[PDB]
Design a protein around this nucleic acid. Structure first.
Ligand SMILES: [Mg+2]
Ligand SMILES: [Mg+2]
Ligand SMILES: [Zn+2]
Ligand SMILES: [Zn+2]
Ligand SMILES: [Zn+2]
Ligand SMILES: [Zn+2]
Ligand SMILES: [Zn+2]
Ligand SMILES: [Zn+2]
Ligand SMILES: [Zn+2]
Ligand SMILES: [Zn+2]
Ligand SMILES: [Zn+2]
Ligand SMILES: [Zn+2]
Lengths: 131, 505, 505, 131
RNA sequence: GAUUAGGCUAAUUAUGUAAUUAGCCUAAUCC
RNA sequence: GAUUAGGCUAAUUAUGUAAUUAGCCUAAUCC
């Protein structure tokens, strides 16, 4: 009964994230210690002519970005644990997330370690020109 | 990789996968969205926006190694070292039903302390906006072996209420014993899945109010505390886990436990399983293998108890050897061959089970051995024999007294921890039917230089007098004897011993 | 007092009361602790320390009067003034089961906007250390009428999500309408029980960003905001409550609503209950009774709309009287007996429904007067008759157009609020089958002192010319006519009307 | 089903406390304006020979005090609402509270508007002599 | 209901065979 | 599952009767 979702190679770190007090630091320490980053992320085929904002309803990726599914690059969705927001709603689920092409090795880690700018909705340091 | 796992399995009865923006993994995407390049396509399609899919928590593995994070699935050798923190743990579960199928949810949690917690069936539900840890539909397992779980489906409490109860019970059990909590399990899979409901892990932390190691975590306060300061806390922090089934056992728990122990029997509840699991672990670590290289730190009045035991031993053996004028002494269990008393001139012989000196023999006393040392006195200080001879002086630990250095054991025995872990067989009074209780008395012959006691054998007390030299010494022997007797030791002697003989010496 | 109430009823299944130190009231204390002096005694008895008891929230009564605190259960006469704030409200509930029995919890919440929210069953649990609001076990009510509630039992969301969704929906509905929120309810008991989950009350407060009255409360920020600034807020602050059942109604909601309305029918959901409740309240306050003494403030372009409507009336009636040269006019619904056009010399007669002047009549036009007034023209500026005659000039508000001055009404009608509230029956195009839609044009005859338009009837446009005196006036008429048309007013005229006749006048 | 707990005469103020942002202020405002104080508290039979401390695990009432059950004099326990403590734990439940005999008309209001001293455990102004 | 091992069938990929996935049967343990 | 109204029974209190509480039945509304 049921349908399988995750690979065994992702089973350890997710288990760790399911038990830690602070999951974000746990995943970052796991990856920075030489652990393998998460896989099985949903990558989208894109004609590469988008606007380049961080989070969007439809895939909008430029020549230097790749589009991922929103739930695939959220650690709390991957581990099926409680989200840290007081509203309780994930900001990634149901939307598409643009990742720079030099950070596609760890999209989950990139989303954990970065936030979009409030006014232009681009990544801070990767598209935000609010000098 | 390519090998899939049952962890986080989608247990919903839906016939279709999720859209790329809502699916958590690539495998979870419906195949109509997929292309040949392991890439998804945002098709022009409507989506099942509101959904609720039960996610399986079965299949955890805490094997990852990160610097700064302790290893929680400890080995056998560390479990023997942390034996004071051993708590048996068993979970009986319920099967997800109705709108979900393919996962199990904890129903009854039992610990070796004898306490059961009944919880409402709660699982993880993925929705269109996030995750929820909420009550789900569940049914008891089919079969007569699980028929007692049917009433428990209407007595479950909420998980945030049960977490604090578990923390409080564990803090009450282990506060004066250990800074740690080691869950002793059998077939640890569902145990770990259930432990995800009330345990938190991380780096090792100090208590916010003292220097003890933190053992509980408070999520409203976001703080860490030891067992003493853990009131109101709702999570167990950094517990150790031990799987007895991985120690080379075949069959189920019940047949393995029944082979060695005949005391832990009763109704089928999770607490009885936990007690049986801890009993089997104790038997495996301290009876099947007896390694005495492990030294355990003192936590109480133990050093003092050893000296009191030696003092009481010297006095009692002096009185017993003097009375009756037996000139032959046999000491069973001595690993050093050193006599306790030397004032009466008597012959000495030494025996031990595992001696490390050629002066001491390897005799194993069973029952026949009474007529061979019939000519003298036989010493059984801290030696356990199910049949003591008529001419013996015996000191046996009462396993029914519970203390910080006495733990429950196997088949009515007890684990006694005094710089070492000795397993002492159950205290049967039928092994002393050939002997008598030793009365309380004192005897000395030191020169002298108010207290009144009829049993105080003393040169002054022959004429009814008393002196400070013996008045303080009797009080010292009094506190030593009281400590030894309240610690759980009992003394036995041959039936012809009497106090009034000591007046003649 | 001595009358007990069902509020805070102990819904647990335990068979005994609590100890004096744990019971909240004297009634809840077990009888073994009580004496004859209405005093309790602390016995030397063990206490069942870990307990959990479900506490009922059914039976709230907000009838307390405290200075500085507004009255929230308003009566009918102020509800009529706050009519712009009216939101229907209905809750469909679930029964506590398993470990509890004797209380209901909200399951589905519905509003007259048409939105339904589904929630987890959450109740109050009394613990030996205090209170906690958490999920409890609940089942749908038995019976065929509630079979649609069975699927929703595992489809809900967490209450913190639903609170912010409710606040967002209410902010969207009432931002440009009012500073307040009035919940229009039927059998307000369980509605108030559910409102305890998402409403906060207190003294009247000001918005933290502007001068508007605060309608939402943010507990993470502990701040107050109006509808415009309530983004992310999670509580409704100081709402009004109205119970329509207390307005003298017998039977249930459905048979009372169906007696007056035929358009609010559908499946059995909470939103349909709420829509029916609001429709019944509208019918009770604005059809059954007509109290036009109540004055409403302006919130938008109403004073401009009146002048534009008067200008359009003068132009259209002037053109209609000039075309065909009818010498007799019957103006229905005029309560003042004042004509709008006087340049053509025609005879005038006036009628009204509830007038206050002896020069006018009290005719109730139904169908039969079509041959009574065929000798002239009949004026129907803002009068509601289901059959307009062949010789009429009619203005009818389109009830399907929704604006700030147009609220939903009863039986497909609408409530038009311009200083006073008029209930206009539904706009049926089949009542104009004896007339024609009025084509747009402009007509004037002022002396003169580039613009081009074929419908601009003007002495210059007869030769194809144009002047500023008419060019500016024609742009003003476009403004006025465009406002009037966009507001929701439709014009109808007799079938023999044509613009080209006005060239001769 | 179930067993009744409270009187109807207390149903008004408790309902108010269940809806207000500040329950303590609302209760004090209600009783200050002339509203009746809460009744049906758990008064204890005592020998009138005690230490006189504010909160105790056994009734310790002197000649000038009366002892009540702790949960019966706590407004948050009475209204079954959230306690102000972050951990949610009541300081009164499961213990006995000594109220001065000149303040027994409103025990709940007295416990709301007073605190015990942190070193001597007496009521400040009603037994505490920490000069 | 869950996992592990074995057998059978089908599909995909790779170079007659191997790996993975899905389904069925047997055994053990867990529920 | 909740409340209101009515009837019956029992208990307590007060002075043949009254009030309150608890249980059962009928009706109405809510779920
Ligand atoms: Mg078991
Ligand atoms: Mg309804
Ligand atoms: Zn997420
Ligand atoms: Zn920016
Ligand atoms: Zn501590
Ligand atoms: Zn055993
Ligand atoms: Zn002496
Ligand atoms: Zn504002
Ligand atoms: Zn209607
Ligand atoms: Zn002109
Ligand atoms: Zn309290
Ligand atoms: Zn003080």
């Amino acid at each position: 009964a049921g349908s399988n979702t995750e690979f065994a190679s992702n089973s350890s770190v997710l288990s760790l994230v399911n038990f830690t007090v602070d999951p974000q630091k746990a995943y970052l320490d796991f990856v920075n210690a030489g652990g393998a980053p998460l896989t099985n992320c949903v990558k989208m085929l894109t004609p590469k002519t988008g606007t380049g904002i961080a989070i969007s309803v439809k895939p909008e990726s430029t020549a230097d970005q790749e589009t991922y599914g929103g739930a695939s690059v959220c650690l709390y969705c991957r581990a099926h644990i409680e989200h840290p927001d007081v509203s309780g709603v994930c900001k990634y689920k149901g939307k598409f997330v643009q990742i720079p092409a030099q950070c596609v090795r760890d999209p989950v880690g990139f989303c954990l370690s970065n936030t979009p700018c409030n006014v232009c909705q681009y990544w801070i340091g990767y598209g935000c020109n609010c000098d | 990789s390519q090998i899939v796992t049952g962890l986080f399995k989608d247990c919903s009865r839906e016939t279709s996968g999720l859209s790329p923006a809502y699916a958590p993994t690539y495998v979870s995407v419906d195949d109509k969205y997929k292309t040949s390049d392991e890439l998804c396509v945002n098709l022009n399609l409507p989506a099942n926006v509101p959904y609720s899919r039960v996610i399986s928590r079965m299949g955890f593995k805490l094997d990852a190694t990160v610097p700064g994070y302790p290893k929680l699935f400890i080995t056998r050798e560390e479990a023997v070292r942390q034996v004071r923190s051993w708590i048996g743990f068993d979970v009986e579960g319920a099967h997800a039903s109705r709108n979900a199928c393919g996962t199990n949810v904890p129903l009854q949690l039992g610990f070796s302390t004898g306490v059961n917690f009944v919880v409402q069936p709660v699982g993880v539900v993925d929705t269109e906006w996030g995750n929820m840890l909420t009550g789900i539909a569940a049914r008891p397992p089919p079969g007569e072996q699980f028929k007692h779980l049917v009433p428990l489906m209407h007595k479950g409490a909420a998980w945030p209420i049960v977490r604090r109860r578990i923390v409080q019970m564990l803090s009450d059990t282990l506060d004066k014993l250990s800074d740690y909590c080691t869950f002793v399990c059998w077939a640890h899979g569902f145990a770990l899945t259930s432990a995800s409901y009330f345990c938190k892990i991380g780096k090792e932390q100090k208590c916010c109010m003292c220097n003890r190691r933190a053992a509980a975590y408070s999520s409203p306060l976001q703080s860490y505390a030891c067992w003493t300061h853990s009131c109101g806390y709702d999570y167990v922090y950094n517990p150790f886990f031990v799987d007895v089934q991985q120690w080379g056992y075949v069959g189920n728990l019940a047949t393995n436990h029944d082979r060695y122990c005949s005391v832990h029997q009763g109704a089928h509840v999770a607490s009885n399983d936990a007690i049986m699991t801890r009993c089997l672990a104790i038997h495996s670590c301290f009876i099947e293998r007896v390694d005495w290289d492990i030294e355990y730190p003192y936590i109480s009045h133990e050093k003092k108890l050893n000296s009191c035991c030696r003092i009481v031993e010297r006095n009692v053996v002096r009185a017993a050897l003097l009375a009756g004028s037996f000139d032959k002494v046999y000491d069973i269990g001595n690993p050093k061959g050193i006599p306790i008393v030397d004032d009466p001139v008597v012959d000495w012989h030494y025996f031990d089970a595992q001696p490390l000196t050629r002066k001491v023999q390897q005799l194993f006393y069973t029952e026949d051995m009474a007529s061979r040392f019939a000519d003298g006195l036989c010493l059984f200080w801290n030696c356990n024999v199910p049949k003591y001879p008529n001419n013996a002086i015996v000191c046996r630990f009462d396993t029914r007294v519970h203390s910080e250095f006495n733990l429950p054991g196997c088949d009515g025995g007890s684990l006694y921890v005094n710089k070492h872990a000795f397993h002492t067989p159950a205290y049967d009074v039928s092994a002393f039917r050939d002997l008598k209780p030793l009365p309380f008395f004192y005897y000395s012959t030191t020169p002298c230089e108010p207290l009144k006691s009829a049993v105080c054998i003393t040169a002054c007390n022959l004429g009814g007098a008393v002196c400070r030299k013996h008045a303080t010494e009797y009080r010292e022997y009094m506190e030593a004897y009281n400590l030894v007797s309240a610690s759980g030791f009992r003394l036995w002697c041959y039936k012809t011993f009497d106090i009034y003989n000591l007046w003649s010496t």
